[PDB]
Amino acid sequence: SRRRVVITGMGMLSPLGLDVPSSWEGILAGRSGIAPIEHMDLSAYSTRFGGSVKGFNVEEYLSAKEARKLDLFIQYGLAASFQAVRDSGLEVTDANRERIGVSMGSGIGGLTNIENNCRSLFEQGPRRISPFFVPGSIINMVSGFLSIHLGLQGPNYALTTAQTTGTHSIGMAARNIAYGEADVMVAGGSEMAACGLGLGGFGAARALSTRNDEPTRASRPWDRDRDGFVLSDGSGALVLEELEHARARGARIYAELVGFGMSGDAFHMTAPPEDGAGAARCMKNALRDAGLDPRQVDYINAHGTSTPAGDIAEIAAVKSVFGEHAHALSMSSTKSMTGHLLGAAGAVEAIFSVLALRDQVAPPTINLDNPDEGCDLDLVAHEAKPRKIDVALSNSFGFGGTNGTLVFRRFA
Amino acid sequence: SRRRVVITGMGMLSPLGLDVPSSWEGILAGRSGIAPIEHMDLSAYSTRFGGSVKGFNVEEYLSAKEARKLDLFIQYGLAASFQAVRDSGLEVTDANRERIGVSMGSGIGGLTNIENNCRSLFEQGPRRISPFFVPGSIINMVSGFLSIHLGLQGPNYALTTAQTTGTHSIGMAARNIAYGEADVMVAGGSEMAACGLGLGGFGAARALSTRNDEPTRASRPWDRDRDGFVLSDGSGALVLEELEHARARGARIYAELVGFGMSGDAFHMTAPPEDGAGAARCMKNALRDAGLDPRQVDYINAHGTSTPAGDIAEIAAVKSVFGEHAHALSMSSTKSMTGHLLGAAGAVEAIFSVLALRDQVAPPTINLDNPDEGCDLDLVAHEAKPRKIDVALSNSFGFGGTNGTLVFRRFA
Numbered sequence: 001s002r003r004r005v006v007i008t009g010m011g012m013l014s015p016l017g018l019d020v021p022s023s024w025e026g027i028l029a030g031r032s033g034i035a036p037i038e039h040m041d042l043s044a045y046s047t048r049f050g051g052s053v054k055g056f057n058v059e060e061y062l063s064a065k066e067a068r069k070l071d072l073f074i075q076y077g078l079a080a081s082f083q084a085v086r087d088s089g090l091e092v093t094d095a096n097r098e099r100i101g102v103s104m105g106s107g108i109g110g111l112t113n114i115e116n117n118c119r120s121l122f123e124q125g126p127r128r129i130s131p132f133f134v135p136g137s138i139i140n141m142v143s144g145f146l147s148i149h150l151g152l153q154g155p156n157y158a159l160t161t162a163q164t165t166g167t168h169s170i171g172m173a174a175r176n177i178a179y180g181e182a183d184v185m186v187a188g189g190s191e192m193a194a195c196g197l198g199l200g201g202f203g204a205a206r207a208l209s210t211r212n213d214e215p216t217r218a219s220r221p222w223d224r225d226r227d228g229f230v231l232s233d234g235s236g237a238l239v240l241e242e243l244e245h246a247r248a249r250g251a252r253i254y255a256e257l258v259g260f261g262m263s264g265d266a267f268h269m270t271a272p273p274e275d276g277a278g279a280a281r282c283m284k285n286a287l288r289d290a291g292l293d294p295r296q297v298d299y300i301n302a303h304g305t306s307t308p309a310g311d312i313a314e315i316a317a318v319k320s321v322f323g324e325h326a327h328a329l330s331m332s333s334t335k336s337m338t339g340h341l342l343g344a345a346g347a348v349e350a351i352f353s354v355l356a357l358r359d360q361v362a363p364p365t366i367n368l369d370n371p372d373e374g375c376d377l378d379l380v381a382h383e384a385k386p387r388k389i390d391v392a393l394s395n396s397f398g399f400g401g402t403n404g405t406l407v408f409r410r411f412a
Numbered sequence: 413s414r415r416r417v418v419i420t421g422m423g424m425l426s427p428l429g430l431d432v433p434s435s436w437e438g439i440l441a442g443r444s445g446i447a448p449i450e451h452m453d454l455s456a457y458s459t460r461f462g463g464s465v466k467g468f469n470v471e472e473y474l475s476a477k478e479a480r481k482l483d484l485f486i487q488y489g490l491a492a493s494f495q496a497v498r499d500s501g502l503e504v505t506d507a508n509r510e511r512i513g514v515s516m517g518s519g520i521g522g523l524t525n526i527e528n529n530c531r532s533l534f535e536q537g538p539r540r541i542s543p544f545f546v547p548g549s550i551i552n553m554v555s556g557f558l559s560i561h562l563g564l565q566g567p568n569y570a571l572t573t574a575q576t577t578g579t580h581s582i583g584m585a586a587r588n589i590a591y592g593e594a595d596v597m598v599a600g601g602s603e604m605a606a607c608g609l610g611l612g613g614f615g616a617a618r619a620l621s622t623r624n625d626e627p628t629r630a631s632r633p634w635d636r637d638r639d640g641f642v643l644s645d646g647s648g649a650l651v652l653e654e655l656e657h658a659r660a661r662g663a664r665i666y667a668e669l670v671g672f673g674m675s676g677d678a679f680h681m682t683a684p685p686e687d688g689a690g691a692a693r694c695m696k697n698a699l700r701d702a703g704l705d706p707r708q709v710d711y712i713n714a715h716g717t718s719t720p721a722g723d724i725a726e727i728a729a730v731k732s733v734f735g736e737h738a739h740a741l742s743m744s745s746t747k748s749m750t751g752h753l754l755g756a757a758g759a760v761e762a763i764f765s766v767l768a769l770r771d772q773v774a775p776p777t778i779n780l781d782n783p784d785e786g787c788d789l790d791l792v793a794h795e796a797k798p799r800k801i802d803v804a805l806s807n808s809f810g811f812g813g814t815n816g817t818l819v820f821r822r823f824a
């Protein structure tokens with residue numbers, strides 16, 4: 001029968017910090033992680049800024065010889081995973097290694113490495129493609145490399161559901177544990193899409209904010225002057241653990257994962273429906289899965305991408321699901337500070353939702369100067385709001401009409 | 413307790429044919445789908461052959477305009493998916509659309525689109541990148557487009573586990589049904605990694621057969637003269653359905669999906685361990701999941717890639733798991749004929765495993781002229797073998813040491 005699942009470890013690289021505490025300190029201070037991109041020349045591009053990981057030292061985790069063969073999204077995914085496992089205190093042994101698995105996902109994976117090898121191929125030839133091109137670029141290799149470094153022999157897979165990846169990865173990993181396929185999973189996502197093809201491709205879709213002259217103000221979810229998402233890099237990982245397993249070893253438990261929802265919109269390849277019908281269906285699935293009264297929800301970490309259609313669809317969905325209680329909960333978009341980590345967004349935002357529960361505080365939506373028509377909920381504008389949070393919900397929505405909702409609650 | 417899951421529809425593109433029955437006729441005749449790759453200058457490449465899909469007409473499925481937005485691997489996955497849904501006879505309605513989902517995956521995703529867009533970026537700059545580059549290249553867009561086209565509102569996701577993708581996709585979709593998260597799932601995988609980038613990337617690792625003079629003899633699993641795998645394109649999709657749901661509408665049931673195993677080797681990024689320990693755990697997990705004794709297995713569709721270390725690891729794993737029964741079962745690699753469809757390998761091989769059950773015939777391992785040291789199992793050399801098959805396994809053992817096993821049983 002279905003077992004309970006708790007969070008015993010977390011790890012992160014974000015535009016606000018090289019770990020969880022430093023990132024969360026930025027979140028509660030209303031700090032922006034967005035700046036002009038330094039790592040490549042973007043003068044020909046319509047967007048020249050984003051959320052970079054600043055000062056990442058891969059040699060805190062991996063030998064230089066190894067790191068040189070891995071795309072940044074793998075390096076970030078391993079860093080976050082190693083943090084989360086260390087934070088959990090779990091010791092991997094012959095007795096438990098078959099019961100510990102990994103599901104770390106990515107929306108796009110090793111696009112920087114694929115781009116650089118494509119340049120080698122076209123300008124020089126196939127003899128100059130790296131021998132490490134495939135295992136250093138394809139999405140399942142965060143799970144793969146992590147399992148080989150720690151000796152994890154449990155379920156080993158990766159999701160790729162665009163901007164929903166981190167949320168799906170955590171939810172499905174929790175189902176693995178619930179149904180008895182594993183006792184422990186490391187789950188989350190990682191992304192580094194800030195190369196020519198990523199910035200150029202989202203640019204060609206006119207999906208990105210073009211506020212080049214004021215990057216910290218670009219990401220402004222539900223603000224009437226928003227003009228698209230801000231592309232950001234990094235990784236989140238959580239250690240999910242069966243409750244009795246965690247109790248037996250005296251684990252520190254941050255929160256319980258009580259609910260997971262998925263739904264497809266079946267609407268449009270990239271656009272969310274205006275009424276947020278798929279998002280509402282997904283949240284309702286998650287709340288029923290958690291055995292909750294919707295009035296129990298205290299805090300929602302929105303998807304909150306700073307796109308015109310996405311932000312207003314999320315208000316519509318929250319009003320449809322929560323009715324008058326929509327006016328009592330707090331909802332914020334931490335993408336106002338971090339930007340959109342794409343396949344890692346749901347992973348870092350699950351961590352922020354768990355820390356909202358630990359610290360009893362709703363993070364702010366910065367830059368919400370002039371809320372748009374109908375955006376009249378408590379969106380925690382400008383400043384962090386201390387408040388009672390027993391139940392927190394993290395939402396994600398992606399290309400393909402793919403929706404995920406996680407429901408966390410305090411554990412006693 | 414758990415619901416039963418049956419297969420009611422199948423769909424395929426392969427190097428042998430543009431549907432299931434044409435592909436299967438090739439399989440049972442021992443035909444090769446491997447040939448020199450056309451309409452590419454492969455002069456500088458060390459491998460110039462593979463398994464292409466021949467004569468695919470996307471306008472049987474999509475308008476030319478929708479087809480122009482999507483990478484070939486998405487086109488292939490939608491073709492297999494539409495075939496599978498047609499073959500199932502399922503009628504999607506407002507009463508069931510929330511109970512029908514999709515999990516179609518890919519190992520490497522949109523290499524052809526990445527190449528074409530890199531050509532534009534490098535030559536002309538980012539403003540020549542296609543607006544549809546991102547949504548038309550990301551791996552979850554088979555699930556996305558299929559859900560939008562057919563109005564499917566159930567779980568919508570995509571796995572990417574390299575060469576194990578199609579097996580994991582099918583197994584995890586079966587779990588969704590068994591545990592009541594869906595009543596119907598379309599599951600499988602698709603791949604189009606000819607392109608320069610696949611042939612170049614695998615070639616850089618010297619992972620490919622270089623038998624350019626005799627492409628049809630290149631893929632020779634367990635043969636002492638094998639010299640690596642053959643890269644191939646296509647797609648496989650199955651309609652998985654809860655048993656009572658299938659019976660209530662009078663569905664044609666091909667077979668029952670009774671078991672699913674996963675494991676991680678935790679050994680090496682690309683090579684399996686010599687004794688196939690992870691593959692053995694995975695098959696034992698899949699049999700335990702099915703409540704079957706190893707002695708009940710009749711037929712194994714091997715991963716059987718024609719890499720020296722992979723093929724011998726599988727023999728060791730099968731000897732370990734099956735002991736005194738290891739010679740009684742028949743095990744064949746259909747990759748001897750199809751080549752290696754990477755993320756679609758497990759999907760087309762699940763279909764071939766189901767058809768082995770329907771037709772009571774083990775497909776051949778062609779090219780098995782001189783079995784290597786210790787390769788002394790019933791590997792169905794050269795010619796198909798009619799035999800009793802009640803229980804068929806399909807194995808996939810991919811990069812990152814990620815393993816999958818599906819167990820199918822005759823249904824009556």
Ligand SMILES: COc1cc(NC(C)=O)c(OC)cc1Cl
Nearest residue numbers: 063065066067069145148149681
């Ligand atoms: C991909 O390159 C490497 C990988 C590992 N380690 C693993 C677990 O894969 C390594 O450990 C000494 C050294 C190198 Cl160079």
